[PDB]
Amino acid sequence: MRHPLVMGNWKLNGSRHMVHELVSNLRKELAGVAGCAVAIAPPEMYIDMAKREAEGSHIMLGAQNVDLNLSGAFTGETSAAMLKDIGAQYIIIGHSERRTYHKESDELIAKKFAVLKEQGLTPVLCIGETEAENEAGKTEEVCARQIDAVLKTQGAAAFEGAVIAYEPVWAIGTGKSATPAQAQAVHKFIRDHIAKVDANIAEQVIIQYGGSVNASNAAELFAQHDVDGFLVGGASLKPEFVDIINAAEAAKQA
Amino acid sequence: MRHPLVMGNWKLNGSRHMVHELVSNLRKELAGVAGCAVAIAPPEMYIDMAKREAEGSHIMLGAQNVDLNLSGAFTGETSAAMLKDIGAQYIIIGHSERRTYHKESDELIAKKFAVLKEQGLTPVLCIGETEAENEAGKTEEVCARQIDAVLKTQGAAAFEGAVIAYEPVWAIGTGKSATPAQAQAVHKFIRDHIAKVDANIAEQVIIQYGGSVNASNAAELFAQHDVDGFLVGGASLKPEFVDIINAAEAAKQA
């Protein structure tokens, strides 16, 4: 049905050496892989280098943010038009680290989703609830809110070709991921919630699960029905990333 | 006494082709200029590209902002160890565009200065006042403030090897530049202000002028005693940046 995506968000980790190594190894390690779609998001100053190193393979490049302006007098910003130019396709927006540390709002993340779409880039929209919200029973409500900032404003056609990445905040870097059962309950909720507005768009939107995915759990998770892939953090930097991609690929070709 | 620095800030402008064009022509057009130190700040995902193209010449590279972490779980952040790895020395911080549009604060802009310095990068701390602040007579108070954020927390020492770039906000992109008399008077004030803490450091701090500078006004402005160079905005993208550089160079060698 949906073609799986495993995307690796490298976060604040990269170097000329590490980019030379990981991507050239991945390139030989992922030769003839056709059941999964793979992308890496190097730190911005390395997107171009990893883009040249990934040539010959089908590793897709991504980026970890965009800002709202395409050009002009905006020091220190990230143009979507330039991300596009340099070869990024998958732009992470709305990750918990920008939401908490950088106090990024739903309204701002939605206007960014808006830009990326308009440009022709795949947003990987992160959503997730915190442990507090989780205990409270608010997971449906948080997730739904967060999807709605795009859904109620721009409409379900916005998700035609986007990626939602459910990343339970209490699961990011903690080591405590959602069980397959948990994971899938929310991916089904998400899908139901877009489908209420347009089921044709719900059926196609990739819902990746992110939040302590590693080789051991990659397969239990992927067995689920509404889990379309993964957004990998820590293990992106480890060779174990290939094993996570192999989970999504061979299970795909069941 | 002080060797001039002309840093071009590209703002949110760039592509693979303009970066090829500008830098190769600059590289060729700056052959033999020793009276001036030159640095360019391409947008982040092009510092590597430009660094490479600038190899051979003595065009130093820079960057338009940093964030406070060097490594980690910080999606979408810029690390100083990473800017340093890709080859950037001059990191602009506190520019009005970040200060207004990104609500960046002095306590923050100071913490970013600390971070640059500790990594061995050269901070280019923008300072300045708005038109309103100018009219009320607050130029002194505003500028001293902004400088004191680093001076009172970190000491006079923080300025050894650091650049201050006075850009009056009413002057940026407006076409309305400070007269050499305005420029000089303020640059002399800043230097007088640091000197009252440590005189020896105040003689070596480069104080650049920025705010609608171009080939015709570079000369008249460089004639002032306390104006050690130029932060160029929009003419960085023009061939007129080299004419600006020849004005700092020829008059330095008086």
Give the dihedral of Cα atoms A249, A251, A252, A253; nearest 10 deg.
Answer: 90
CA A88, A89, A90, A93 torsion: positive or negative? positive
Q: H/E element holding B80? A: helix B80-86
H/E run at residue B53: helix B47-54
Determine the length of chain B.
254
C-alpha–C-alpha distance, residues A47 and A94, integer Å: 20
Burial of B80 (0-12, 13-18, 19+ CB in 10 A): buried
Q: Any binding-site annotation on B94? A: no
A:B CB pairs within 8 Å: 116
Do A16 and B172 make contact, defined as CB atoms within 8 angstroms? no
Cα first-last separation, chain B: 12
B75 with A92: Cβ contact below 8 A: yes
* CA pseudo-torsion sign A50, A19, A9, B16: negative
E strand or H helix at A61, and its extent? strand A60-63
Check the CA dihedral A76-A82-A87-A91 and report its sign. positive
Element (H, E) at B20: helix B16-29
**Burial class, A142, CB count within 10 angstroms (exposed 0-12 / middle 13-18 / buried 19+):** middle
Q: CB B73 to CB A14 under 8 A? A: no
The DSSP H or E segment spanning B19 is helix B16-29
Structure tokens at A242: 């290939």
> Resolution to 1 decimal, in Å?
2.8
* Whole-number Å distance between alpha carbons of A60 and A44: 14
| Measured distance CA(A40)–CA(A61) in Å, rounded | 5
Interatomic CA distance for residues A51 and A59, integer angstroms: 8
Does B214 show up as a binding residue in the annotation?
Answer: no
CA angle B109, B111, B115 (to 5 degrees): 110
Q: Which amino acid is at B60?
A: M
Task: Tell which residue, B27, B11, B55, has the closest CA to residue B239.
Answer: B27
Whole-angstrom CA distances from B117 to A140, B195, B208 are 46, 20, 18
> Which residue among A53, A95, A97, A129 is the active-site one?
A95
Angle at B140 between CA B136 and CA B145, to 5 degrees: 110
Which strand (E) or helix (H) includes residue A179? none
Return the closest-CA partner of residue A13 out of A54, A39, A43, A38: A43
Pick from A13, A73, A95: which is nearest to B97 by CB?
Answer: A73
Active site residue B102: no
Ranges of beta strands (E only) in B31-175 are 37-41, 59-63, 90-93, 122-127, 163-166
**A193 catalytically annotated:** no
Instruction: Return the H-helix or E-strand segment holding A123.
Output: strand A122-127
Contacts of residue A245, Cβ cutoff 8 Å, sequence gap at least 6: A6, A30, A33, A36, A38
Among chain A residues, CA nearest to B83: A45
For B155-212, where are the alpha helices, taking DSSP H only?
180-195, 199-204
Rg (CA), chain A: 17
Given an 8 Å threshold on Cβ–Cβ distance, is A71 in contact with B13?
A: yes
Min Cα distance B158 → chain A (Å) is 23
Contact yes or no for B176/B212 (Cβ under 8 A)? yes
- Measure the CA–CA gap between B237 and B112, rounded to whole angstroms: 27
Instruction: Give the span between the Cα atoms of B106 and B222, in whole angstroms.
Output: 28
Paired sense of beta strands B37-41 and B5-9, if any = parallel
Q: Which residues contact B137 (CB under 8 A, 6 or more apart)?
A: none
The residue to which tokens 């506190």 are assigned: B94
Place of tokens 């990191």: B91
> Which chain B residues are Cβ-neighbours of A72 within 8 angstroms?
11-13
Chain B residues with at least one Cβ partner in A under 8 Å: 9, 11-16, 43-49, 64-65, 69-79, 82-83, 85-86, 92, 95, 97-98, 101-102, 172-173, 233
Cβ of A72 within 8 Å of Cβ of B46? The answer is no
Instruction: Answer whether B81's CB lies under 8 Å from B119's CB.
Output: yes
Ligand-binding annotation for B173, yes or no, is yes
Tokens of B218: 């570079």
Alpha helices in A45-94 (DSSP H): 47-53, 80-86
> CA–CA separation, A116 vs A123, rounded Å?
6
Q: What residue has token string 């800030």?
A: B9
Q: Which two tokens stand for residue B5?
A: 């620095």
Collapsed DSSP state (helix, strand, coil) of residue B222: helix
- Angle, CA of A222, A227 and A232, to the nearest 5°: 75
- Centre a 10 Å sphere on the Cβ of residue A187 and count the other Cβ atoms it contains: 22
Q: What is the DSSP letter of B232?
A: E
Q: Which two tokens stand for residue B89?
A: 């020395």
Yes or no, beta carbons of A45 and B102 under 8 Å apart: no
Interatomic CA distance for residues B155 and B149, integer angstroms: 10
Q: Closest to B98 (Cβ–Cβ): which among A12, A70, A75?
A: A75
Q: Which of B53, B129, B167, B249 is catalytic?
A: B167
Can you tell me the distance from the alpha carbon of A171 to that of A213, in angstroms, rounded to the nearest whole number?
9
Which chain B residues are Cβ-neighbours of A116 within 8 angstroms?
Answer: none
> For A9, which residue in chain B has the nearest alpha carbon?
B75
Contact at CB, B92 and A76, closer than 8 angstroms: yes
**Residue whose structure tokens are 């899908």:** A191
Dihedral of alpha carbons A26, A32, A33, A38, sign: positive
Which CATH architecture does the domain made up of B1-254 adopt?
Alpha-Beta Barrel (3.20)
Q: Where are the alpha helices (DSSP H) in chain A?
A: 16-29, 47-53, 80-86, 96-99, 106-119, 131-136, 139-151, 180-195, 199-204, 215-222, 241-252
Closest CA to A87 of A23, A34, A29, A158: A23
Q: Helix H segments across B100-236?
A: 106-119, 131-136, 139-154, 180-195, 199-204, 215-222
Q: Are A117 and A91 in contact (CB under 8 A)?
A: no
Spatial neighbors of A107 by CB under 8 A, at least 6 apart, are: A149
Going by DSSP bridges, is the β-strand pair B5-9/B229-232 parallel, antiparallel, or unpaired? parallel
Minimal Cα distance from B9: which residue of A? Answer: A75
Contact (Cβ atoms closer than 8 angstroms) between residue B75 and residue A97: yes
How far apart CA A27 and CA A254 sit, in angstroms, is 24
| Residue of A11, A47, A71 with shortest CB distance to B73 | A11
